[PDB]
Swiss-Prot record, chains A, B:
NCBIfam families: asd_gamma, PRK06598.1
Root EC class: oxidoreductase
Self-association state and partner proteins as the record states: Homodimer.
Protein name stated in the entry: Aspartate-semialdehyde dehydrogenase
Similarity comment: Belongs to the aspartate-semialdehyde dehydrogenase family.
Gene3D superfamilies per the UniProt record, alphabetical: Dihydrodipicolinate Reductase, domain 2, NAD(P)-binding Rossmann-like Domain
Annotated source species: Haemophilus influenzae (strain ATCC 51907 / DSM 11121 / KW20 / Rd)
GO molecular function, one term: NADP binding
Domain remark text: Consists of two domains, an N-terminal nucleotide-binding domain and a C-terminal dimerization domain.
Lineage: Bacteria, Pseudomonadati, Pseudomonadota, Gammaproteobacteria, Pasteurellales
Reactions mediated catalytically: L-aspartate 4-semialdehyde + phosphate + NADP(+) = 4-phospho-L-aspartate + NADPH + H(+)
Keywords: Amino-acid biosynthesis, Diaminopimelate biosynthesis, Lysine biosynthesis, Methionine biosynthesis, NADP, Oxidoreductase, Threonine biosynthesis
Residues the record lists as binding phosphate: R88, K231
Superkingdom, natural source: Bacteria
Binding site for substrate: Q148, E228, R255
Length: 356, 356
């Protein structure tokens, strides 16, 4: 069995990885060595890390940027598996999402690539839902509008969202108890609390609770995009292996009041005019996790929501129809869990392949 | 002075209209006669309604479809102003949004049109923001993705959203107070509460607080669109007077956890390649309510959110840049209050013109 090092296993993404690995009994297939940054071996000890065959880290970019150059400088020929964004764009690294790019991964393992990194949450959840259209060379471009959860921002951000929500209802606790009260008065009090100084907004920089934030990560002055939006064009094409001739995937990334699921609204311009039934079969046949939801009200409310998909491996896609712009314009809406397919699952699955 | 009848003045839309009319001293220029459905004159007394010049109603479509044909059957030559969707698509009716379609209203007044109806909230808020692009005949098509507030569905829907928000936090109040508690444990509990039997989901048919619903209104079998989505293509073109040569406006209408502001994400395909600064000036110059928000983080978080715009007449539009698809593709994000420009304001303004 392989000797595997685990760093950042105590954090949010790391804990989801530990829980998933325990569920699938992945630990019986490898020899686990747990690391810690605390003053269990030290995560900064290159001499201990050098003994291992594979290193799995959910610690973050700052750690990766500090220890990865130092470790690869000793002549170490092992594998680096990362959940963080730091090494995604390097030429000796592959962005991993096996149900979509098993070919790129298999050909890369044959090429001697030692660094494997999980992809951007919104990109990976999009490809898990709409990868069938990419496989059959049907996508010309995709216009994206996201509904992102507090999960992607961090653990303290999820807690702030919850605190914000409770404070919004508390401001009108008494008024909500009697059915005869004025709704405009209720709203005036909820909005006043949202705008108050004592309303906890330090993690977001604005209220998320009964609002939204149409900006995620820093600005790239050259394009006007945010880093989260930029990753839609850059990472989709690297995963699929189309970096030399890219497919335009661009849009707006918005943070909404959800805990764990990222939802996305698409306007997909296809290369061919195809029947709607045929498009539904192309995306349903791609992988075992994608679930095509029929264009009906009761089934959409029950299946295509964060309430339904939180904590599951299911990637439902629905609202499938042709848009008024033309027969090659397809509407699609998807919901997926940020911590699983958007973070811990592509990392779990590549490890399984490496220890096989 | 003109004798004006007011029906549905005590409901949510009506109360906003009453407050706005009071703020602008609109009652000084007319003679108000208030009606009621309770057992003030009766709202169903056709003879009392006939004695009036103009009738402004916020009561709803069920009232209109009952009282309107009975009133027109007496030979009444007065004006009907409605906030309800019932008569929007009728040939003898005009949809009002004067800062965008004053010409259609002015020509309609001269032709002898007696019925003026307020438009669909999302369509109205979209046109208030990017009406400049439509004015200059620059729009080929628009793909929409909305972030709709609970006020669009009703007063009890807003109450249900708030009650839901409180229950989600109350489920983890001790854990949130504990700075060292597990986030995975916190999430497991709020998600369990969201899925519980006693969680209030009566008005929406699903959870909204901590989630979203990608379906608003009835299905339109012919296209696959929901009625809210259909109103995009149909109403934008009736407002602008372009029903003979329509501009495609289509997309996905999603309900999120906001109280009274609808936010919208667009991918606008323009007819010509124009510099960004010119497009920003074309958008800004259209009306005095639209506000172009520069593509900066601090300014976007402070200005382009439901938190900032709630209860105001301001219609901010930002995140303006060219998309990766090409220089004729424009990204834009807007936020607007549903009860004002999306409900009471276009009704308030048309009345002001009729009583002049």
């Amino acid at each position: 069995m392989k000797n595997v090092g685990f760093i950042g296993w105590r954090g949010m993404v790391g804990s989801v990885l530990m829980d998933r690995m325990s569920q699938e009994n992945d630990f019986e297939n490898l020899n686990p060595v747990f690391f810690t940054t605390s003053q269990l071996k030290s995560a900064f000890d290159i001499e201990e890390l050098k003994k291992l065959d594979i290193i799995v880290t959910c610690q973050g970019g700052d750690y990766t940027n500090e220890v990865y150059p130092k470790l690869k400088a000793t002549g170490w020929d092992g594998y680096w598996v990362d959940a963080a964004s730091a090494l995604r764009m390097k030429d000796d690294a592959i962005i991993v999402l096996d149900p979509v790019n098993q070919h790129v991964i298999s050909e890369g393992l044959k090429k001697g690539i030692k660094t494997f990194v999980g992809g951007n949450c919104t990109v990976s959840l999009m490809l898990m839902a709409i990868g069938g259209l990419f496989e059959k060379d049907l996508v010309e471009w995709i216009s994206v509008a996201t509904y992102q959860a507090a999960s992607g921002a961090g653990a303290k951000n999820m807690r702030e969202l919850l605190s914000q929500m409770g404070l919004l209802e508390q401001a009108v606790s008494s008024e909500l108890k009697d059915p005869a009260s004025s709704i405009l008065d209720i709203e005036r009090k909820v909005t006043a609390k949202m705008r108050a100084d004592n309303f906890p907004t330090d993690n977001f920089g604005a209220a998320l609770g009964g609002s939204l934030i149409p900006w995620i990560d820093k600005l790239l002055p050259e394009t006007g995009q945010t880093k989260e939006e930029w990753k839609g064009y850059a990472e989709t094409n690297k995963i699929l292996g189309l970096s030399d001739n890219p497919i335009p995937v661009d849009g707006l990334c918005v943070r909404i009041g959800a805990l764990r699921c990222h939802s996305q609204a698409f306007t997909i311009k296809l290369k061919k005019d195809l029947p709607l039934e045929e498009i539904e079969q192309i995306i349903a046949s791609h992988n075992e996790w994608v679930k095509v939801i029929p264009n009906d009200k009761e089934i959409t409310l029950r299946e295509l929501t964060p309430a339904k998909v939180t904590g599951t491996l299911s990637v439902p896609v629905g609202r499938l129809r042709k848009l008024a712009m033309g027969p090659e314009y397809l509407a699609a809406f998807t919901v997926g869990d940020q911590l699983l397919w958007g973070a811990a699952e592509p990392v779990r699955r590549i490890l399984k392949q490496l220890v096989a």
